[PDB]
Paper text:
Voltage-dependent K+ channels, including GORK, contain three regions: an intracellular N-terminal region, a transmembrane region, and an intracellular C-terminal region (27–30).
As a result, five different structures of GORK ranging from the transmembrane region to the C-terminal ANK (designated as GORKWT1–GORKWT5) were determined at resolutions of 3.16 to 3.27 Å. The five GORK structures showed N-terminally an almost uniform transmembrane domain (positions 50 to 313 from the initial Met), including the voltage-sensing domain and the ion selectivity filter. In contrast, the following cytosolic regions, i.e., C-linker (positions 314 to 364), CNBD (positions 365 to 490), CNBD–Ankyrin bridge (positions 491 to 542), and ANK (positions 543 to 722) show five distinct structures in almost twofold symmetry (C2 symmetry). Furthermore, we found a structural difference in the short structure that lies between the CNBD and ANK domains, termed as CNBD–Ankyrin bridge containing residues 511 to 519. This region had an α-helical structure in GORKWT1, while in GORKWT5, it was entirely present in a nonhelical loop conformation.
Author numbering:
A (entry chain B): 50 to 514
B (entry chain D): 306 to 618
C (entry chain C): 202 to 514
The structure:
């Protein structure tokens, strides 16, 4: 549908991504400057007259481009590229707030006789922080950065914005009082060191802003030195509201960080297991070699990432099948049991496969246990033994890499003949008996070709003889 | 700091485990004596590191067997019940056991109960409380370290001769009936070594020595009844039960009270597979029963010419 | 929310009690009270008993709220011994109650579900995919499908595993039943058979352009399209796959190969996001092992229905 109506921009189109990174910088500046130009400026001085105008222009173009960029649907999950469909999304979602923000509110304030209530509409431009919200949402999708880490960074930016706006509102509340009563304000009575903020409306903009932001930051961490404090009743009320909201926000920050530490523990789980397991070895004085074997198994649990093999049960059948066709298919060719058969039969063996990893010394299949899975030794070595009447085990031919064991027992539908042991780390690819059986029924000619390969494999190892 | 505290306190886990249990106990309106025994036993479990078994849940069979052979096996090898065994047999049980710590002044097993699990004694002394007709007790054996109880019933196919008594704190080693039975069928000569020991070690035992007279009888009817099961399976045709019965230590050369072998029975019936397996054992082809019937003549009598073919083979 | 309301009540009461303790002193000693000695900027709260009610309330509530977050500006502060004791009690209680607030917020966040769990699953999956160095387009397939699964609440089935097979069967018969009725493959069947067909069904959603099943394959899943559009493609040696039929809503596919016991006749390729019920070939077979009357009624319907499409016919 992107050809059907031209001029439409893909949601993740390269040029639109560049414009997103540009309008994100402009949105950060606009949302961090609107409180400044509101509180510290009862009328924006002409020195910055250009810098505001261009700013609005920067978003004005964005009001137009968002009327052409496509959006991925939430119903069909498919990108819809129709200007008729595209325009409605803006016109309902966020066009009103952005358009009201784009007006020259400072000029309108200066063109209406300097009425402060008109200047109050400047706070509409704070809704441009939705761009930063979108940026953080998109960054959350990226697996590059943790979801909880993104959450805590978002909360830190929330504190940044809240303190900046709180300082600006605090200075504005100081300015609402008439200059002759400036001694009743929080700043007009400030006497830090030998510097008294007596005529505080004439101080440099940055000195005033730094004082107000110092108050905001020290109250953000609730240090509350007391050097700068609310004096008015408007100042008292605003400090109460800010303090309560910031209590909630700081509690959320502590909660986000604590949840990140508690939940987000990956190798710390192996370490916790090591703690009590080493306690076990020490209180029972296990041999150093055996201790090494146990630690090897636990590290193996986090190094075999069987969970990374368990996930495939959740991915649907076909896509998992193609994963198998790209990974297990070489290992499948290496099997001498299959050897030369139809490529379709080999592909079906490939599709239904369950990769497994095992541990040196541990045994895998037991004698007398009805074979339930058909194992291929792909990367490793494997050795079976049979306990006799006296009990001594019967050594058999070892199963080195690129071999298939347990196949004969499945073919004869008999219990596992010998108790097989894992000599070292093995890439034990697994096929369920039933899957292999159905595959054989469909490919009967390949099945007989396997039967030939089977007789050869029988004479190959005398223990199968 | 919050994560360090929330990772769970070994005690808090114990307390949580205990609470849940006690909530169940009050929910069932349980009695003080039993509650106290239960709570105490939970106590001994947690401070003796019961969760070690939970930790042992994940390390595989080989390493678990190794730690078992490093802890239990030195203690087991000093138990006369399993002296004379093939070392393989001892190590196998050592893989399949569970240490358990009991509070002093207690009791586990009860005279006449189904034995189920078997128990050793790693440490501590135990009193063989054998309830009489009146209700009183006498200990004819004191189960100290490197001793065992529950064996008498399992190996000799009876019920427990005694209600055992925990004299003091005691660490014992559990062996399930079913697993012990598995390992006991795997090995043959050392299983008979068990049986011979159970006879020769029944000397200190005295009321268990009257039990031991009945045990002489029990070995007798055990091998006899085992042979009767083999023959009955041969006649009935349960080839699978034939396999399981012969794997239970049955002698294919044993004949029943009529001097009739299971080979004879399968021959007259015609179950050539039962015949063939007893052939693989090596039962005499030319044996004659009490009535003179040979497996050959058993086969010819019923016209079992397939069995005759196997017999002539 | 309850803890925040408790904060509101406790700070309001603390402000009222603090101002009250200021008023307990006689007016002549107003200089020793917290408010009578309070000089903020120019306004000195000298005759604090005669100041506007809302000025006094704002001052007292200011202190209360400030102390609640432990900002402790110090502009308004306790002076008397009664005020010292009350402030001690207030901040000691507020410590515990604000720690309760922090603990509840942290516990809320710790109980992270949905986007949190899916994000973790995405990170683990991305790591595994990098390990296997899978096809970048196939990587897009993996990520898109699991993202869909998040939005299409695939993990719901895990939750449905908790509720037993009875109520689960009821959920299935109350949701899948109409869709299974619309499919003409089961034009004639018994209620038990249709109910069993419904019970084993599993929902799955698929992304446009993908391959549901490859041609000439052992199909192990009869599917039932509910929403969207699917299609079948005839791959030859040249690879010139040709459309068979647009598998629209209620167009079951894979049944042909399953019942015919042949390889997949046509590669099934996706056109739009499709909701499909799934039935393992084995499950359909076992239900056929019982209700084979139902299955042969299908077979007749296979005849008449496949007559419609000459490619299917």
């Amino acid at each position: 549908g992107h050809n059907d109506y031209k001029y439409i921009i893909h949601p993740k189109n390269r040029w639109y991504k560049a414009w997103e990174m540009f309008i994100l910088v402009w949105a950060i500046y606009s949302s961090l400057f609107t409180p400044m130009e509101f509180g510290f400026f009862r009328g924006l001085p002409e020195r910055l007259f250009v810098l505001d105008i261009v700013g609005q222009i920067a978003f004005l173009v964005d009001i137009v481009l968002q009327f052409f960029v496509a959006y991925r649907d939430t119903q069909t999950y498919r990108t819809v590229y129709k200007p008729t469909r595209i325009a409605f999304r803006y016109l309902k979602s966020h066009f009103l707030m952005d358009f009201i923000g784009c007006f020259p509110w400072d000029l309108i304030y200066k063109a209406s006789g300097k009425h402060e209530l008109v200047r109050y509409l400047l706070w509409i431009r704070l809704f441009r922080v939705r761009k930063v919200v979108e940026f953080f949402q998109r960054l959350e999708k990226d697996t590059r950065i943790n979801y909880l880490f993104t959450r805590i960074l978002k909360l830190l930016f929330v504190e940044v914005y809240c303190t900046h706006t709180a300082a600006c509102i605090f200075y504005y509340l100081a300015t609402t009082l008439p200059p002759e009563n400036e001694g009743y304000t929080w700043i007009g009575s400030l006497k830090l060191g030998d510097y008294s903020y007596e005529n505080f409306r004439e101080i440099d903009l940055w000195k005033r802003y730094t004082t107000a932001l110092y108050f905001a930051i020290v109250t953000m961490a609730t240090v509350g030195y007391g050097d700068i404090h609310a004096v008015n009743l408007r100042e008292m009320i605003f400090v109460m509201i800010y303090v309560s909201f910031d209590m909630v926000l700081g509690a959320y920050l502590i909660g986000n960080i604590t949840a990140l530490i508690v939940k987000g523990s990956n190798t710390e789980r192996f370490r916790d297991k090591m703690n009590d397991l080493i306690s076990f070895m020490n209180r029972k004085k296990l041999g150093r070699d055996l201790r090494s074997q146990i630690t090897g198994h636990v590290r193996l649990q986090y190094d075999s990432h069987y969970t990374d093999t368990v996930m495939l049960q959740d991915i649907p059948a076909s896509i998992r099948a193609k994963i198998a066709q790209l990974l297990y298919l070489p290992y499948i060719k290496k099997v001498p049991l299959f050897k030369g058969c139809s490529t379709e039969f080999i592909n079906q063996i490939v599709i239904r496969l369950h990769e497994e990893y095992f541990l040196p010394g541990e045994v895998i299949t037991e004698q007398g246990n009805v074979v339930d899975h058909l194992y291929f030794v792909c990367e490793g070595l494997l050795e079976a033994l049979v306990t006799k009447t006296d009990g001594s085990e019967e050594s058999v031919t070892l199963l080195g890499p690129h071999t298939s064991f347990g196949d004969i027992s499945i073919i004869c539908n008999i219990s596992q003949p010998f108790t097989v042991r894992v000599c070292e780390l093995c890439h034990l690819l697994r096929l369920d008996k039933q899957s292999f059986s159905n595959i054989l029924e469909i490919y009967f000619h390949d099945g007989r070709t396997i039967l030939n390969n089977i007789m050869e494999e029988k004479e190959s190892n005398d223990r199968i003889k | 700091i919050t994560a360090l505290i929330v990772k769970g306190s070994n005690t808090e886990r114990f307390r949580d485990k205990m609470n849940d249990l006690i909530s169940f106990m009050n929910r069932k309106k349980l009695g003080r004596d039993l509650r106290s025994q239960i709570t105490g036993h939970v106590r001994l479990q947690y401070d003796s590191h019961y969760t070690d078994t939970v930790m042992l849940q994940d390390i595989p069979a080989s390493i678990r067997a190794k730690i078992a052979q490093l802890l239990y096996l030195p203690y087991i090898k000093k138990v006369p019940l399993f002296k004379g065994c093939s070392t393989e047999f001892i190590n196998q049980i050592v893989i399949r056991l569970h240490e358990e710590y009991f509070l002093p002044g207690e009791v586990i097993t009860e005279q006449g109960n189904v034995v189920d699990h078997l128990y050793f004694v790693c440490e501590g002394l135990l009193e063989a409380l054998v309830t009489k007709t009146d209700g009183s007790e006498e200990s004819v054996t004191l189960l100290g370290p490197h001793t065992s109880f529950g064996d008498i019933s399992i190996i000799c196919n009876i019920s427990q001769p005694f209600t055992v008594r925990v004299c003091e704190l005691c660490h014992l080693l559990r062996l399930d009936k079913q697993s012990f039975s598995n390992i006991l069928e795997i090995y043959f000569h050392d299983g008979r070594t068990i049986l011979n020991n159970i006879m020769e070690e029944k000397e200190s035992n005295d009321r268990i020595k009257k039990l031991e007279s009945d045990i002489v009888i029990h070995i007798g009817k055990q091998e006899a009844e085992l042979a009767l099961k083999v023959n009955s399976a041969a006649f009935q045709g349960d080839f699978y039960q034939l396999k399981s019965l012969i794997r239970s230590g049955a002698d294919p050369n044993k004949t029943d009270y009529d001097g009739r072998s299971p080979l004879h029975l399968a021959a007259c019936r015609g179950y050539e597979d039962i015949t063939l397996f007893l052939i693989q054992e090596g039962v005499d082809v030319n044996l004659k029963d009490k009535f003179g019937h040979t497996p050959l003549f058993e086969a010819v009598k019923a016209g079992q010419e397939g069995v005759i073919g196997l017999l002539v083979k």
